[PDB]
Amino acid sequence: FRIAQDVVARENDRRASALKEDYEALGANLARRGVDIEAVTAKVEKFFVAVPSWGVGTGGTRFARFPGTGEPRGIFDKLDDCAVIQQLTRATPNVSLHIPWDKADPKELKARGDALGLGFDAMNSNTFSDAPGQAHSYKYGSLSHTNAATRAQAVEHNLECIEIGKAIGSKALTVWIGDGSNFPGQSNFTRAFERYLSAMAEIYKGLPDDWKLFSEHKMYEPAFYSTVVQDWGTNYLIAQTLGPKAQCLVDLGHHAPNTNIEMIVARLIQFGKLGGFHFNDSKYGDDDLDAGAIEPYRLFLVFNELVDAEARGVKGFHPAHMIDQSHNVTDPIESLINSANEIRRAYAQALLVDRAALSGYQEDNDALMATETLKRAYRTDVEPILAEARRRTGGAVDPVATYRASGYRARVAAERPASVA
Amino acid sequence: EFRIAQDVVARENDRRASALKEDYEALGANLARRGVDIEAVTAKVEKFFVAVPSWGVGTGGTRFARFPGTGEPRGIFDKLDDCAVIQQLTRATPNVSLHIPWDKADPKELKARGDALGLGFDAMNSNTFSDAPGQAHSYKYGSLSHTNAATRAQAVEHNLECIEIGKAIGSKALTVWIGDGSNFPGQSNFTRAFERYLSAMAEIYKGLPDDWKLFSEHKMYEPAFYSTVVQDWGTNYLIAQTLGPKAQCLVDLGHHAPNTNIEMIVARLIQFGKLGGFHFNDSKYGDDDLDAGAIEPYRLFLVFNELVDAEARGVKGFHPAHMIDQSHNVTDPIESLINSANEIRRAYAQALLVDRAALSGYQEDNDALMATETLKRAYRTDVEPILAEARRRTGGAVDPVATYRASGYRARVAAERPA
Amino acid sequence: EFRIAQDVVARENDRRASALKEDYEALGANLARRGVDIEAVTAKVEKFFVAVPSWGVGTGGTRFARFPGTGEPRGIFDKLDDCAVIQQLTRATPNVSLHIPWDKADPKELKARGDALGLGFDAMNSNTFSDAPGQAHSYKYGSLSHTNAATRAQAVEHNLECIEIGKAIGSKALTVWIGDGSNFPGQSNFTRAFERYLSAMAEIYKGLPDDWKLFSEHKMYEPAFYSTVVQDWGTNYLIAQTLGPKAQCLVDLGHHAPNTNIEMIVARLIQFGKLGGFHFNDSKYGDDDLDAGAIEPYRLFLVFNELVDAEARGVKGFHPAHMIDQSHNVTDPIESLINSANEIRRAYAQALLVDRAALSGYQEDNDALMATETLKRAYRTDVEPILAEARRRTGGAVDPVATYRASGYRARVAAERPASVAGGGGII
Amino acid sequence: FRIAQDVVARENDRRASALKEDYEALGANLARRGVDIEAVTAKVEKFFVAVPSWGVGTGGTRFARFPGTGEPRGIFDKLDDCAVIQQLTRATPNVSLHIPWDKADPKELKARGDALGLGFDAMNSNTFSDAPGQAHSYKYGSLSHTNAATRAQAVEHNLECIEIGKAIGSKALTVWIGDGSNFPGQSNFTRAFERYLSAMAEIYKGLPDDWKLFSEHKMYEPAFYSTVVQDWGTNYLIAQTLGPKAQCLVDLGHHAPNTNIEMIVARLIQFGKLGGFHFNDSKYGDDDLDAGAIEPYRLFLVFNELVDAEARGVKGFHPAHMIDQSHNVTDPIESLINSANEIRRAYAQALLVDRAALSGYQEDNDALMATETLKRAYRTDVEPILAEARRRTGGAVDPVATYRASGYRARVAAERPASVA
């Protein structure tokens, strides 16, 4: 146990009275609305989102990185920190690894995971940066690089990610690359995309029968003029071209200003190509901020689409959700905790929507009551539900407060040496 | 008189009184545990008012089409009758803002009708973004900043007329939003156009009563698609600062560039004493003029967080002239204004719930996570019971839209008004 | 017929003939030093055409107001007379795109008038984004994707009628742009609305002759301010792929989210054979519908770079149906359409100057600087002499707007057509 | 000379004939337009823009930095490379230094500058990152930090920058900070600004009589929710509040999407607060791309405002222009050369605008002819003017071609060791 049980118990007991009052008050209010709070809590306690191993360390910008104390030294320290998030929120049982940052003996990774009560989600390849001893640089691209040898090198890297994943229990490979151009004319849009499609087709052939290959679009950054996989349209063309095992990932902050992101989610689901959603929030670009910290309603609207799919009876829909954030000015663990909380919060609210009433207002084109039907769910404070779900599953009623009371950060700060060079 | 039968209001209130008592008492207990007296909040909420636009009671449209509903108001008198419903049921919109010449009519009759309906009059709104019948000079190429002196003079005179009308009905301010700008690079000389605007506004200011305020409203684009004279809050500040103490800036939510941090603009204008008021609506793409809070309710809350913080910081002489400015293209205008007025009080109530002492502590200690969580604890609170009880206690409806529909008001005016 | 007196055209051409010869010969020498034959470029420019929207010759407006000019066209026939002026002077707009029901009239008269004016007819345009007098079902909440079956059927029938009208006048395509969408979250179920749209379009598709095309046009927003059924090229692609071989996508410059790489979308649609055509205009904020190239001329060039690259790589079965779609709120509509058609040919001509071999080399070598400079060398070239000479040799004017103004055309039609009144837009 | 004179002479003679033909042809065309090409050329050869010392090194993103060969390390290597840009373009005689990156003995800096034929422009302070041994971190801000000692440290650093500047011939201090917040509530907008204003007042007091203090606004990055100096409005409030010696800098890529930047330039000039413009181009955010590579017309429209002011000599209008770009996928020297070229290009074209005719069309509301009057200038290919201006002043007809012919990059590659073979 990363966090002492007596601490979790103590902090839970301290807040039990208030939780009881709020939960029972909410339960009665929901009952008057025809909703069984117990049915909602039962589903909330089973909603999981993968945590990125790279999100536990402090992030930075091109201008600077301001590390906190006790920064994880490697993947094993990162898993240790991910275990804190899972123990306290019970919403992040699986961790997504990034290669080569997290490269290590697969057996040791699996053993540590099992010891901490953590599983492993989708593997993530890295061809947006150069690793030591690399025969070819990814400065001008990777999977879509003009140089055949460079693409082959990128392909082999992705195949290695699959091998590592097969050894630790992973069932998917996520591919996000920075490939693109910074100047008009620098790249031939079509040929670059063709090169990418050819390389991804090779990676696709290395997929086990029960694996998925996820491609992730991004409007810009690192490329500032054009990006090969720039939007969901190109992303759909990729997944449709590659095959049944290839699907698209939607990262909230990877879209143009004012984009209706929830619609993209709906479109991909309709055509069976929504592999998963990567959570974070943003205001300007791919800010990678804590989920729901900027636009909580948008997060709820994305979940409304995810829940409606289930309501419509979409078959074989098992998206692979993951948080992908950079924590530049907070304790990474605390941000991941509250971000996972916001995600469950939006999910819980989406479950409260009176779909029967909504379908009626939609058919009669009663726009005001339709939007108000969504708002009645979104306006509901579901914190008591989230808190009870945690209590029941061994988590903390107030995760961050408990984390702080445990003195975990100070503890790892004394155990881990800060990098000097 | 009452546009909505008092027995319908009573009936629809009693029907929901039991559940409201339950929700209000529960929220009261929760707030008490948080060191907040729900009664103090309700008391402030029932005193929060936002002006309704006379032009918002009719169905709006786009350049592609307008799809009117039934019982559309024929003139300003029908509009006042409809605005009276919004005030009667929400009790949050006691004042109506008129637009000239659309609402031109015997000011004396307007005031009489207002008093009878329990409505007051807010800021006057001039119109030099469209041509009126018999108008000598067209505003096609501008008004107050038009290159032709005679055209600017006509625009100035029109604004002065708006003032005369407002003085007769109890208005204490003139809001100036013009479409002046250009659609092509080179069409206008940015500086000369602005100089002309400033000189024209100075004439209006000269004729402004000393118990009135003059509001200028910035807009990034539309109707101008390349440049706009009063394009942003920076230019707006220059205008207000140049004109005088009685001149201030109006911030309309949907009038900013994509991703703009609007709540910061609000804070900046307050700090320099030039925030005349805020015009509410919501948007996703541009100046969509949608129902307030229908798209980004948190942003609305953040704007109110700055308004409430101004009081908390002890800012003096701060009395913003708030107004709703929306276009209702696919809903019953009355229902939208009702729920928009509600959303505005909702964000206000949540802002009142912010533990300012705690927030200040987290800000000084640079505890970003707890600081943002402190705002969220307020925002996540469902204040609907407070809004409903405030309405119930002041003569309004627990559920305004439900009561509105139960009254059959729309069917009623549809029969009294042409098709 | 000649809307503009031939003597005026000749007069204004002779007046500028000397300077043109000097500039054309100078550019010719410069291009020669660059291994380019100016005659080869002029020859292609003279053959580049873009359809003109019938509704574009009238003064446009916003939801706040409309400020009509003098001599506003009363209907399709007046509009055709005005379009004829654009074609006569620029020689770049031989075909006109009709909009129904605005231009509804006897197919025989339409065709007869076009022939007399030297105008052909391009893609038909359906209108289910507004209500017409006596209409049985309102399109307030949608049309092809409306929740009401009868409303959808009415919309389908209207579109089929557009195809019938087009078959009688020489048209070979139907363009479908609707405002269908929502203004509030929850108002529409995104997926169900799209399913309804697809099903309705499938019915329209069934009525397409074997040599006809069906074009769907995406738009991020307006009139819908929360969601739009056909919101972007991604959805547009799904439509075209679902409907069939005869269904393709139209890309309207100002219909994209801020900062979108529009030229890439063009390339993507070409790669997958679904580029139905490009609708020209320019913008700075949203769907401003401004004169092409008036705001971002380089972006216009970059779009043409993708079009010309395809036109050079032999891309078979590539005959995009280009059209101008602009709103002229503060200029004489005819003059704007004239200079817009000119800007389009300007971008095209510059794209033709790109050294494709050199560019290909810099791309393979990842020489970003020289690759971008290769495009700039073409774009920086002032091809006005080529455009003017192309017009001169084909019966057009060296300086179209100058000739238009010298002819007194506007004042003429102003004296023949009833006066128009200014007013407010759909705002109220 | 960084570049051998014989190479410059050889590559000039190689293109002399074609240049003579084009310059004469353009001179004749301009003559027919009532314009004297010589008057334009004379001004163009005198138009200068400062080069950032940090611009000659390869730039990167938060994902990676892909260095080229012969990367300059330290201000001395950087000045050596900046000298190449000046020798070949003759448009960048002054270099802007950044402290502490360029910290060195002033006498040695001044000595090296004079030897290379380079002067020193505005000083640039750095409180958006932490230097080793720093007492207080700038993680949560600097000049506007809640901690007094942190603000005092930032103020002292800026004063040290002025001291360094005084010793090498600089006459201004540019202040761009990352100060802001990533979460709603993290900062109190008004209080943070009050602290900033108070700290800048202290810096202003240390300004010599002939010095200027420039504040630079930026919408976002590194702050992803709010930024203290977020736009020109706040920037104006700063300059007007500080005093006569304080003005505002406008960096092209620091604005919200679709912003009309040329209008901002005009507004600041009208109120005497345009301290200078920082050139670069962009498509998505603060991309810091080569000037004019994305939107050359916008660059021309900005210069249309600058030239209009220059023609009349507006009170307080004496801009301190500088290039501020990041070269992530090109040879930094080549990009700076062609960027400086684009800047002079737009300047030259703005010089061609028939102001009398334009004013006439503006007064008559003839929008079509007014815009066409600008286009007639913009459509003019002024390359012959730029090339002749360089040739007449000791520069190269074709800067990049001459740079490549000289083999400079391979030369410094041999003198400077890369991190890896």
PDB file of C-alpha atoms in Angstrom, chain C residues 125-309:
ATOM      1  CA  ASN C 125     -28.337  24.797 -56.552  1.00  0.00           C
ATOM      2  CA  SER C 126     -31.220  23.657 -54.350  1.00  0.00           C
ATOM      3  CA  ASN C 127     -32.683  25.813 -51.583  1.00  0.00           C
ATOM      4  CA  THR C 128     -33.997  24.135 -48.433  1.00  0.00           C
ATOM      5  CA  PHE C 129     -32.477  26.648 -46.018  1.00  0.00           C
ATOM      6  CA  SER C 130     -35.408  29.057 -46.331  1.00  0.00           C
ATOM      7  CA  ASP C 131     -39.182  28.912 -46.764  1.00  0.00           C
ATOM      8  CA  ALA C 132     -40.950  29.832 -49.997  1.00  0.00           C
ATOM      9  CA  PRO C 133     -44.511  31.210 -50.210  1.00  0.00           C
ATOM     10  CA  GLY C 134     -47.154  28.482 -50.069  1.00  0.00           C
ATOM     11  CA  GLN C 135     -44.629  25.926 -48.819  1.00  0.00           C
ATOM     12  CA  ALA C 136     -46.355  23.011 -47.075  1.00  0.00           C
ATOM     13  CA  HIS C 137     -43.630  22.283 -44.505  1.00  0.00           C
ATOM     14  CA  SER C 138     -41.234  24.761 -42.899  1.00  0.00           C
ATOM     15  CA  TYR C 139     -37.469  24.152 -42.893  1.00  0.00           C
ATOM     16  CA  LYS C 140     -37.071  25.978 -39.577  1.00  0.00           C
ATOM     17  CA  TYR C 141     -35.813  22.817 -37.859  1.00  0.00           C
ATOM     18  CA  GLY C 142     -34.143  21.322 -40.900  1.00  0.00           C
ATOM     19  CA  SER C 143     -34.910  19.876 -44.313  1.00  0.00           C
ATOM     20  CA  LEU C 144     -33.217  16.742 -45.649  1.00  0.00           C
ATOM     21  CA  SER C 145     -32.451  15.764 -42.032  1.00  0.00           C
ATOM     22  CA  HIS C 146     -35.675  17.107 -40.480  1.00  0.00           C
ATOM     23  CA  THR C 147     -37.321  14.757 -37.946  1.00  0.00           C
ATOM     24  CA  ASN C 148     -40.613  14.943 -39.873  1.00  0.00           C
ATOM     25  CA  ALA C 149     -40.792  12.489 -42.791  1.00  0.00           C
ATOM     26  CA  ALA C 150     -43.114  14.718 -44.831  1.00  0.00           C
ATOM     27  CA  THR C 151     -40.685  17.622 -44.523  1.00  0.00           C
ATOM     28  CA  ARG C 152     -37.794  15.441 -45.691  1.00  0.00           C
ATOM     29  CA  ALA C 153     -39.881  14.157 -48.617  1.00  0.00           C
ATOM     30  CA  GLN C 154     -40.732  17.728 -49.605  1.00  0.00           C
ATOM     31  CA  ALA C 155     -37.023  18.589 -49.558  1.00  0.00           C
ATOM     32  CA  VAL C 156     -36.151  15.545 -51.662  1.00  0.00           C
ATOM     33  CA  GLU C 157     -38.857  16.420 -54.174  1.00  0.00           C
ATOM     34  CA  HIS C 158     -37.511  19.969 -54.445  1.00  0.00           C
ATOM     35  CA  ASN C 159     -34.005  18.712 -55.195  1.00  0.00           C
ATOM     36  CA  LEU C 160     -35.310  16.305 -57.831  1.00  0.00           C
ATOM     37  CA  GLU C 161     -37.124  19.255 -59.397  1.00  0.00           C
ATOM     38  CA  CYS C 162     -33.785  21.087 -59.538  1.00  0.00           C
ATOM     39  CA  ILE C 163     -32.333  18.159 -61.470  1.00  0.00           C
ATOM     40  CA  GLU C 164     -35.220  18.272 -63.947  1.00  0.00           C
ATOM     41  CA  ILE C 165     -34.730  22.001 -64.512  1.00  0.00           C
ATOM     42  CA  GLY C 166     -31.005  21.438 -64.958  1.00  0.00           C
ATOM     43  CA  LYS C 167     -31.460  18.662 -67.513  1.00  0.00           C
ATOM     44  CA  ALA C 168     -33.485  21.050 -69.680  1.00  0.00           C
ATOM     45  CA  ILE C 169     -30.841  23.792 -69.677  1.00  0.00           C
ATOM     46  CA  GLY C 170     -27.613  21.817 -70.031  1.00  0.00           C
ATOM     47  CA  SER C 171     -26.590  21.488 -66.383  1.00  0.00           C
ATOM     48  CA  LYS C 172     -24.722  18.348 -65.288  1.00  0.00           C
ATOM     49  CA  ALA C 173     -24.760  18.568 -61.498  1.00  0.00           C
ATOM     50  CA  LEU C 174     -26.734  19.433 -58.379  1.00  0.00           C
ATOM     51  CA  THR C 175     -25.104  21.223 -55.451  1.00  0.00           C
ATOM     52  CA  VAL C 176     -26.658  20.659 -52.046  1.00  0.00           C
ATOM     53  CA  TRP C 177     -25.895  23.053 -49.190  1.00  0.00           C
ATOM     54  CA  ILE C 178     -28.354  23.097 -46.304  1.00  0.00           C
ATOM     55  CA  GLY C 179     -28.384  24.909 -42.977  1.00  0.00           C
ATOM     56  CA  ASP C 180     -29.528  21.772 -41.140  1.00  0.00           C
ATOM     57  CA  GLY C 181     -28.162  21.636 -37.627  1.00  0.00           C
ATOM     58  CA  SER C 182     -28.863  22.706 -34.067  1.00  0.00           C
ATOM     59  CA  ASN C 183     -28.381  25.809 -31.920  1.00  0.00           C
ATOM     60  CA  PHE C 184     -28.448  23.988 -28.579  1.00  0.00           C
ATOM     61  CA  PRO C 185     -26.807  20.885 -27.125  1.00  0.00           C
ATOM     62  CA  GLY C 186     -29.366  18.072 -27.013  1.00  0.00           C
ATOM     63  CA  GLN C 187     -31.681  19.671 -29.594  1.00  0.00           C
ATOM     64  CA  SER C 188     -30.448  17.184 -32.197  1.00  0.00           C
ATOM     65  CA  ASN C 189     -29.153  13.638 -31.886  1.00  0.00           C
ATOM     66  CA  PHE C 190     -26.043  13.959 -34.076  1.00  0.00           C
ATOM     67  CA  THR C 191     -26.112  10.403 -35.391  1.00  0.00           C
ATOM     68  CA  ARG C 192     -29.853  10.107 -36.026  1.00  0.00           C
ATOM     69  CA  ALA C 193     -29.873  13.447 -37.857  1.00  0.00           C
ATOM     70  CA  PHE C 194     -26.997  12.330 -40.096  1.00  0.00           C
ATOM     71  CA  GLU C 195     -28.725   9.004 -40.804  1.00  0.00           C
ATOM     72  CA  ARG C 196     -31.821  10.908 -41.923  1.00  0.00           C
ATOM     73  CA  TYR C 197     -29.697  13.142 -44.161  1.00  0.00           C
ATOM     74  CA  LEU C 198     -27.935  10.171 -45.756  1.00  0.00           C
ATOM     75  CA  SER C 199     -31.222   8.392 -46.431  1.00  0.00           C
ATOM     76  CA  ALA C 200     -32.749  11.488 -48.038  1.00  0.00           C
ATOM     77  CA  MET C 201     -29.670  12.148 -50.185  1.00  0.00           C
ATOM     78  CA  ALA C 202     -29.775   8.519 -51.329  1.00  0.00           C
ATOM     79  CA  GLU C 203     -33.203   9.292 -52.789  1.00  0.00           C
ATOM     80  CA  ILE C 204     -31.881  12.362 -54.604  1.00  0.00           C
ATOM     81  CA  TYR C 205     -28.973  10.267 -55.868  1.00  0.00           C
ATOM     82  CA  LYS C 206     -31.431   7.853 -57.513  1.00  0.00           C
ATOM     83  CA  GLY C 207     -32.694  10.668 -59.730  1.00  0.00           C
ATOM     84  CA  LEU C 208     -29.272  11.562 -61.128  1.00  0.00           C
ATOM     85  CA  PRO C 209     -28.690  10.968 -64.847  1.00  0.00           C
ATOM     86  CA  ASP C 210     -25.679   8.764 -65.650  1.00  0.00           C
ATOM     87  CA  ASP C 211     -23.539  11.782 -66.547  1.00  0.00           C
ATOM     88  CA  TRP C 212     -24.563  13.921 -63.562  1.00  0.00           C
ATOM     89  CA  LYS C 213     -22.828  14.561 -60.245  1.00  0.00           C
ATOM     90  CA  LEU C 214     -24.261  15.261 -56.791  1.00  0.00           C
ATOM     91  CA  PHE C 215     -22.252  17.698 -54.671  1.00  0.00           C
ATOM     92  CA  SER C 216     -22.571  17.989 -50.900  1.00  0.00           C
ATOM     93  CA  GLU C 217     -21.077  21.105 -49.301  1.00  0.00           C
ATOM     94  CA  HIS C 218     -19.819  21.249 -45.719  1.00  0.00           C
ATOM     95  CA  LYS C 219     -19.931  24.286 -43.436  1.00  0.00           C
ATOM     96  CA  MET C 220     -18.752  24.540 -39.831  1.00  0.00           C
ATOM     97  CA  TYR C 221     -21.565  26.863 -38.731  1.00  0.00           C
ATOM     98  CA  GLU C 222     -24.253  29.396 -39.753  1.00  0.00           C
ATOM     99  CA  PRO C 223     -27.204  29.294 -39.846  1.00  0.00           C
ATOM    100  CA  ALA C 224     -26.719  26.622 -37.143  1.00  0.00           C
ATOM    101  CA  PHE C 225     -24.708  27.852 -34.156  1.00  0.00           C
ATOM    102  CA  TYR C 226     -24.049  24.728 -32.086  1.00  0.00           C
ATOM    103  CA  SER C 227     -23.862  21.849 -34.565  1.00  0.00           C
ATOM    104  CA  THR C 228     -24.266  21.401 -38.312  1.00  0.00           C
ATOM    105  CA  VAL C 229     -25.032  18.041 -39.924  1.00  0.00           C
ATOM    106  CA  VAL C 230     -22.539  18.521 -42.756  1.00  0.00           C
ATOM    107  CA  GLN C 231     -20.035  20.416 -40.606  1.00  0.00           C
ATOM    108  CA  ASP C 232     -16.693  19.514 -42.206  1.00  0.00           C
ATOM    109  CA  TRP C 233     -14.847  17.673 -44.964  1.00  0.00           C
ATOM    110  CA  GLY C 234     -14.685  14.549 -42.824  1.00  0.00           C
ATOM    111  CA  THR C 235     -18.468  14.258 -42.697  1.00  0.00           C
ATOM    112  CA  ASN C 236     -18.599  15.386 -46.314  1.00  0.00           C
ATOM    113  CA  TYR C 237     -16.278  12.526 -47.270  1.00  0.00           C
ATOM    114  CA  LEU C 238     -18.474  10.018 -45.439  1.00  0.00           C
ATOM    115  CA  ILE C 239     -21.441  11.318 -47.436  1.00  0.00           C
ATOM    116  CA  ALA C 240     -19.741  11.067 -50.842  1.00  0.00           C
ATOM    117  CA  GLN C 241     -18.316   7.627 -50.083  1.00  0.00           C
ATOM    118  CA  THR C 242     -21.697   6.373 -48.862  1.00  0.00           C
ATOM    119  CA  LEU C 243     -23.858   7.745 -51.691  1.00  0.00           C
ATOM    120  CA  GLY C 244     -21.765   6.600 -54.630  1.00  0.00           C
ATOM    121  CA  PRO C 245     -19.373   7.313 -57.553  1.00  0.00           C
ATOM    122  CA  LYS C 246     -21.481  10.247 -58.734  1.00  0.00           C
ATOM    123  CA  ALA C 247     -21.361  11.921 -55.310  1.00  0.00           C
ATOM    124  CA  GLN C 248     -18.460  14.269 -54.528  1.00  0.00           C
ATOM    125  CA  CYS C 249     -17.448  17.038 -52.116  1.00  0.00           C
ATOM    126  CA  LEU C 250     -17.360  20.811 -52.557  1.00  0.00           C
ATOM    127  CA  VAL C 251     -14.859  22.883 -50.588  1.00  0.00           C
ATOM    128  CA  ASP C 252     -15.929  26.473 -49.893  1.00  0.00           C
ATOM    129  CA  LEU C 253     -12.932  28.503 -48.708  1.00  0.00           C
ATOM    130  CA  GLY C 254     -14.659  30.347 -45.865  1.00  0.00           C
ATOM    131  CA  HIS C 255     -16.488  27.312 -44.441  1.00  0.00           C
ATOM    132  CA  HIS C 256     -13.714  26.086 -42.151  1.00  0.00           C
ATOM    133  CA  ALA C 257     -12.623  26.483 -38.542  1.00  0.00           C
ATOM    134  CA  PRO C 258     -10.056  29.189 -37.750  1.00  0.00           C
ATOM    135  CA  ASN C 259      -6.514  28.326 -38.901  1.00  0.00           C
ATOM    136  CA  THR C 260      -7.596  25.227 -40.834  1.00  0.00           C
ATOM    137  CA  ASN C 261      -5.160  24.028 -43.493  1.00  0.00           C
ATOM    138  CA  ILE C 262      -7.639  24.214 -46.355  1.00  0.00           C
ATOM    139  CA  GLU C 263      -5.193  23.311 -49.129  1.00  0.00           C
ATOM    140  CA  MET C 264      -4.539  19.983 -47.371  1.00  0.00           C
ATOM    141  CA  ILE C 265      -8.247  19.179 -47.418  1.00  0.00           C
ATOM    142  CA  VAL C 266      -8.186  19.805 -51.169  1.00  0.00           C
ATOM    143  CA  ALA C 267      -5.265  17.402 -51.579  1.00  0.00           C
ATOM    144  CA  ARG C 268      -6.937  14.744 -49.422  1.00  0.00           C
ATOM    145  CA  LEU C 269     -10.173  14.870 -51.426  1.00  0.00           C
ATOM    146  CA  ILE C 270      -8.202  14.650 -54.681  1.00  0.00           C
ATOM    147  CA  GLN C 271      -6.239  11.645 -53.412  1.00  0.00           C
ATOM    148  CA  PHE C 272      -9.492   9.809 -52.729  1.00  0.00           C
ATOM    149  CA  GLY C 273     -11.297  11.016 -55.841  1.00  0.00           C
ATOM    150  CA  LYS C 274     -13.963  13.033 -54.051  1.00  0.00           C
ATOM    151  CA  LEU C 275     -13.078  16.633 -54.919  1.00  0.00           C
ATOM    152  CA  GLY C 276     -16.246  17.756 -56.673  1.00  0.00           C
ATOM    153  CA  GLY C 277     -15.070  21.325 -56.896  1.00  0.00           C
ATOM    154  CA  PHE C 278     -13.910  24.399 -55.036  1.00  0.00           C
ATOM    155  CA  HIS C 279     -16.117  27.379 -54.183  1.00  0.00           C
ATOM    156  CA  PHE C 280     -14.079  30.571 -54.168  1.00  0.00           C
ATOM    157  CA  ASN C 281     -14.157  33.597 -51.881  1.00  0.00           C
ATOM    158  CA  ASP C 282     -11.934  34.892 -49.095  1.00  0.00           C
ATOM    159  CA  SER C 283     -12.353  35.429 -45.382  1.00  0.00           C
ATOM    160  CA  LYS C 284     -10.742  36.682 -42.210  1.00  0.00           C
ATOM    161  CA  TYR C 285     -13.212  35.770 -39.445  1.00  0.00           C
ATOM    162  CA  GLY C 286     -15.744  33.183 -40.590  1.00  0.00           C
ATOM    163  CA  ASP C 287     -17.833  32.595 -43.691  1.00  0.00           C
ATOM    164  CA  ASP C 288     -17.331  36.236 -44.687  1.00  0.00           C
ATOM    165  CA  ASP C 289     -17.822  35.436 -48.377  1.00  0.00           C
ATOM    166  CA  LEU C 290     -15.448  38.234 -49.404  1.00  0.00           C
ATOM    167  CA  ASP C 291     -13.870  38.778 -52.843  1.00  0.00           C
ATOM    168  CA  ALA C 292     -11.438  35.953 -53.633  1.00  0.00           C
ATOM    169  CA  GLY C 293      -7.869  36.819 -52.691  1.00  0.00           C
ATOM    170  CA  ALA C 294      -8.748  40.144 -51.046  1.00  0.00           C
ATOM    171  CA  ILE C 295      -7.586  38.947 -47.613  1.00  0.00           C
ATOM    172  CA  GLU C 296      -5.161  36.038 -48.124  1.00  0.00           C
ATOM    173  CA  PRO C 297      -3.896  35.864 -51.719  1.00  0.00           C
ATOM    174  CA  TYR C 298      -1.131  33.413 -50.786  1.00  0.00           C
ATOM    175  CA  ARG C 299      -3.619  30.920 -49.365  1.00  0.00           C
ATOM    176  CA  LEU C 300      -5.512  31.122 -52.665  1.00  0.00           C
ATOM    177  CA  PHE C 301      -2.247  30.387 -54.494  1.00  0.00           C
ATOM    178  CA  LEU C 302      -1.517  27.433 -52.193  1.00  0.00           C
ATOM    179  CA  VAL C 303      -4.924  25.945 -52.991  1.00  0.00           C
ATOM    180  CA  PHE C 304      -4.179  26.298 -56.704  1.00  0.00           C
ATOM    181  CA  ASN C 305      -0.783  24.710 -56.132  1.00  0.00           C
ATOM    182  CA  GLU C 306      -2.638  21.553 -55.095  1.00  0.00           C
ATOM    183  CA  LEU C 307      -5.025  21.872 -58.051  1.00  0.00           C
ATOM    184  CA  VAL C 308      -2.233  22.437 -60.578  1.00  0.00           C
ATOM    185  CA  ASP C 309      -0.052  19.682 -59.115  1.00  0.00           C
TER     186      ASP C 309
END
